[PDB]
Amino acid sequence: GTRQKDLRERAERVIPGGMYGHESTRLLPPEFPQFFRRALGARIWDADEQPYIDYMCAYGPNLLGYRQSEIEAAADAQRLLGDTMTGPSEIMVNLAEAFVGMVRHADWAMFCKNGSDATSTAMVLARAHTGRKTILCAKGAYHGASPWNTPHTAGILASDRVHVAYYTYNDAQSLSDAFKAHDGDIAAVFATPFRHEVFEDQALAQLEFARTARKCCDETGALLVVDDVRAGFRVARDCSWTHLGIEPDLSCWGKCFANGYPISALLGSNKARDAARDIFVTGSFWFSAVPMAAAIETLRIIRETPYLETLIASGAALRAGLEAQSQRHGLELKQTGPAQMPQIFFADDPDFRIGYAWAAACLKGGVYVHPYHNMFLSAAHTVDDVTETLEATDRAFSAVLRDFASLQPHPIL
Amino acid sequence: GTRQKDLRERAERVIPGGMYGHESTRLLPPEFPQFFRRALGARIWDADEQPYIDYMCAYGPNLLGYRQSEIEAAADAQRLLGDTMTGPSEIMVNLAEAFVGMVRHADWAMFCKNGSDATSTAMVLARAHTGRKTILCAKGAYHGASPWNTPHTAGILASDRVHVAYYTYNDAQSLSDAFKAHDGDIAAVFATPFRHEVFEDQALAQLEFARTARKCCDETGALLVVDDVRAGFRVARDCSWTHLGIEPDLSCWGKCFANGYPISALLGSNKARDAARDIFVTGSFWFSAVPMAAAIETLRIIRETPYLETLIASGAALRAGLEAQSQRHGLELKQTGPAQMPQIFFADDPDFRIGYAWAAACLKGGVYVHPYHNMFLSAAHTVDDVTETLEATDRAFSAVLRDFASLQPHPIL
Ligand SMILES: *Cc1c(COP(=O)(O)O)cnc(C)c1O
Numbered sequence: 001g002t003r004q005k006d007l008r009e010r011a012e013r014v015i016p017g018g019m020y021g022h023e024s025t026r027l028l029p030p031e032f033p034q035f036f037r038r039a040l041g042a043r044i045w046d047a048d049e050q051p052y053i054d055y056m057c058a059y060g061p062n063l064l065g066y067r068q069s070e071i072e073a074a075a076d077a078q079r080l081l082g083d084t085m086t087g088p089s090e091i092m093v094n095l096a097e098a099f100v101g102m103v104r105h106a107d108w109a110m111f112c113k114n115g116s117d118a119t120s121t122a123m124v125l126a127r128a129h130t131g132r133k134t135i136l137c138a139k140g141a142y143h144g145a146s147p148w149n150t151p152h153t154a155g156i157l158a159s160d161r162v163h164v165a166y167y168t169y170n171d172a173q174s175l176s177d178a179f180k181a182h183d184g185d186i187a188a189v190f191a192t193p194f195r196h197e198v199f200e201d202q203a204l205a206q207l208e209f210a211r212t213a214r215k216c217c218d219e220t221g222a223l224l225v226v227d228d229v230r231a232g233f234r235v236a237r238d239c240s241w242t243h244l245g246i247e248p249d250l251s252c253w254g255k256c257f258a259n260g261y262p263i264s265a266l267l268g269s270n271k272a273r274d275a276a277r278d279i280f281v282t283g284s285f286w287f288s289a290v291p292m293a294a295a296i297e298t299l300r301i302i303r304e305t306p307y308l309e310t311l312i313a314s315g316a317a318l319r320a321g322l323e324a325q326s327q328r329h330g331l332e333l334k335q336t337g338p339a340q341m342p343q344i345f346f347a348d349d350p351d352f353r354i355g356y357a358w359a360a361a362c363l364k365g366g367v368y369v370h371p372y373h374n375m376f377l378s379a380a381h382t383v384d385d386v387t388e389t390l391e392a393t394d395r396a397f398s399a400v401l402r403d404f405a406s407l408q409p410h411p412i413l
Numbered sequence: 414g415t416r417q418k419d420l421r422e423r424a425e426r427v428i429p430g431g432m433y434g435h436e437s438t439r440l441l442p443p444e445f446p447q448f449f450r451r452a453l454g455a456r457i458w459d460a461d462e463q464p465y466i467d468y469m470c471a472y473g474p475n476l477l478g479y480r481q482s483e484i485e486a487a488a489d490a491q492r493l494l495g496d497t498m499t500g501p502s503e504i505m506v507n508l509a510e511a512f513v514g515m516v517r518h519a520d521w522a523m524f525c526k527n528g529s530d531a532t533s534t535a536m537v538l539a540r541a542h543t544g545r546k547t548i549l550c551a552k553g554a555y556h557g558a559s560p561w562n563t564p565h566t567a568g569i570l571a572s573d574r575v576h577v578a579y580y581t582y583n584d585a586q587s588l589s590d591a592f593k594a595h596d597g598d599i600a601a602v603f604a605t606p607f608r609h610e611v612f613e614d615q616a617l618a619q620l621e622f623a624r625t626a627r628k629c630c631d632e633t634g635a636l637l638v639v640d641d642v643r644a645g646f647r648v649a650r651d652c653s654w655t656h657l658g659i660e661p662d663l664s665c666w667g668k669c670f671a672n673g674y675p676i677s678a679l680l681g682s683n684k685a686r687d688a689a690r691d692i693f694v695t696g697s698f699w700f701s702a703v704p705m706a707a708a709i710e711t712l713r714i715i716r717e718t719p720y721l722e723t724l725i726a727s728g729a730a731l732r733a734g735l736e737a738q739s740q741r742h743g744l745e746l747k748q749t750g751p752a753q754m755p756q757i758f759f760a761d762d763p764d765f766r767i768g769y770a771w772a773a774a775c776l777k778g779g780v781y782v783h784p785y786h787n788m789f790l791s792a793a794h795t796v797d798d799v800t801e802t803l804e805a806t807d808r809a810f811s812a813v814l815r816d817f818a819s820l821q822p823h824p825i826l
């Protein structure tokens with residue numbers, strides 16, 4: 001990787017550590033490229049023009065395929081009109097109508113940039129609404145990288161999160177107890193719609209857990225907040241708890257509802273409308289029309305096409321394939337969570353040395369898979385993509401067995 | 414008009430209060446349109462296709478003109494390659510090199526979405542760097558709408574800002590005293606490069622204030638942070654304190670350095686590089702290429718063209734024109750701050766009833782000016798635009814004189 005190497009030398013001079021945040025390759029095998037040149041459909045190309053079938057989907061945003069022609073057409077049409085203007089475009093009204101119409105629990109929407117903006121807004125809203133302090137979150141749940149919730153706490157004060165308290169995800173007793181430990185002071189419960197965290201097996205939400213969240217919120221006046229930034233529109237065409245029959249008061253959305261254009265949302269029921277008006281949240285870029293035009297067209301496609309069934313079928317095929325290959329090579333997998341947003345670990349691999357080696361070996365076959373973070377399917381992944389993926393993964397299992405003696409854990413990890 | 418009324422009716426249903434944040438027309442005279450259709454150069458068109466010469470410049474981002482063709486071509490070129498991908502584009506390196514090369518105090522850059530992202534990152538970085546808690550800000554200075562700094566505190570806890578302390582802007586003794594009041598506990602000083610706040614006259618930064626900030630930071634090891642999100646690239650082609658001979662440790666940038674594309678930055682010296690690596694900040698959209706391509710082209714135009722001299726000359730002409738005009742009509746204006754980012758109030762107008770009537774009367778003449786928030790000039794405003802503007806302001810001054818006895822203050826204000 002001549003170009004990659006040049007880019008990494010230069011990057012370290014002018015970017016702290018060469019790169020930062022969730023897309024940094026600091027904790028990945030060294031074979032993983034940091035910098036890319038182009039993307040299309042379900043593929044990315046690194047700086048040295050090596051293609052990869054992309055199972056990160058840009059860490060969520062690529063729902064329908066990179067440079068999907070209908071969304072790029074809608075964005076083009078709005079770009080001729082205006083983007084970041086002295087006021088929002090009229091199409092802000094159309095977007096809020098569309099999004100509110102699709103989400104059964106919601107009567108209103110607010111638009112922002114980052115998913116962290118929507119979760120932070122939900123936190124402040126809930127405190128305004130209830131006049132209480134305590135925000136309940138699941139231990140280890142990722143809701144953004146603000147001082148109140150960032151998972152690494154360099155430069156974070158105890159005071160930044162003194163009124164955040166924790167429960168065990170999928171543990172109805174734990175959540176009940178959390179309500180009583182801060183009796184009378186719960187502003188909100190935040191829940192992701194399933195367990196989707198790094199270095200950990202995924203798990204679907206348990207019905208009893210979700211019901212208890214809704215019932216405790218009901219009995220106390222606390223707001224139920226579903227954080228759908230990650231799973232939104234890959235579980236359902238509505239809030240990801242729709243199939244449990246549990247409606248939140250607020251839901252947070254982002255990543256993929258404009259297929260890569262930067263826009264996030266807070267959706268809320270009429271119960272929370274007054275508090276939403278009382279709080280002050282804004283940003284320079286929150287009223288920009290082009291991301292809103294992309295979102296309108298993405299949401300239309302979500303409503304009008306079998307995008308969801310398509311990307312689930314691709315996910316299921318990959319999962320079945322990997323199960324068969326794992327048995328054949330005698331290397332047991334743990335494929336957890338929904339097949340369309342899979343976590344694919346090795347059984348009995350506590351320092352991840354097997355998973356790391358397998359993921360790196362998949363790069364050589366032109367497949368990008370991730371050894372510690374959940375993956376994603378797009379509606380642009382084809383049957384041929386899955387077939388070619390499985391040829392790469394087959395070779396990767398062989399390469400891991402061939403080298404098995406010499407496998408090492410990642411130093412930094 | 415008719416379209417505007419329909420949109421406001423529809424907006425109220427699906428958006429809390431029908432709109433929110435800085436771009437809400439809540440506190441403006443009712444003639445101000447909320448929703449727009451298009452923008453080009455120095456003009457915006459509301460939903461009823463009425464054009465205005467725009468002196469808000471989208472509340473800062475429109476530095477070079479809406480849909481500036483060279484920036485749009487650079488954005489097009491990148492859009493054919495890739496935008497939001499599994500990793501950043503190689504052009505992130507080019508951007509960082511360019512921005513670092515232009516900013517004398519800076520050795521590295523980090524990119525995010527919101528200006529609030531950059532200011533929050535600088536806060537967390539300073540705490541990590543120093544191991545101290547206290548952040549010093551000027552009373553009433555706007556640094557974003559995060560829980561630690563948001564100007565309206567519905568849903569905000571005392572604990573959200575218990576380690577933020579305040580000084581009086583442009584009062585060196587006040588700042589020096591705030592250092593001593595938290596002796597050995599100052600992580601950072603934040604300062605905007607001039608006073609630019611709503612409902613208040615603007616004021617340029619005093620040299621002795623800026624030197625005291627630098628010297629107290631030098632003596633204590635606190636980081637000096639200049640918040641250049643609003644003023645950046647309308648004062649200078651570097652950090653807005655360049656002409657005072659004062660270099661900060663960190664500077665925050667946003668709004669206009671990609672001419673409307675959503676991107677913000679934190680620029681830092683090597684002193685702060687280790688802390689920058691230690692903290693965890695990220696966002697789904699922070700590594701998107703197309704705003705970075707727009708930023709590279711905007712920065713080139715900033716370096717290679719007389720854009721700054723152009724918008725300063727336009728601002729200077731408008732200011733001299735309005736001074737002469739107001740005097741002829743027997744009304745005194747208070748035109749404060751740089752001519753290129755002016756606050757234009759009336760003398761002896763404590764409840765803004767005069768300023769509000771005047772601003773409203775300007776709208777009728779195809780001029781968008783703001784009675785409580787600073788305005789902005791773009792390099793796309795021409796001498797003829799200013800000439801046409803002064804014809805409309807003439808009729809506005811006459812309308813104010815005519816209706817003078819019947820002026821009433823804004824209800825909600
Ligand atoms: C607008 C502004 C910010 C915040 O930027 P957003 O993009 O709105 O989050 C920060 N500092 C100053 C001086 C500003 O004017």
Ligand SMILES: [Mg+2]
Pocket residue numbers: 100101102103104105106107
């Ligand atoms: Mg609804």
Ligand SMILES: [Mg+2]
Pocket residue numbers: 512513514515516517518519520
């Ligand atoms: Mg420099």
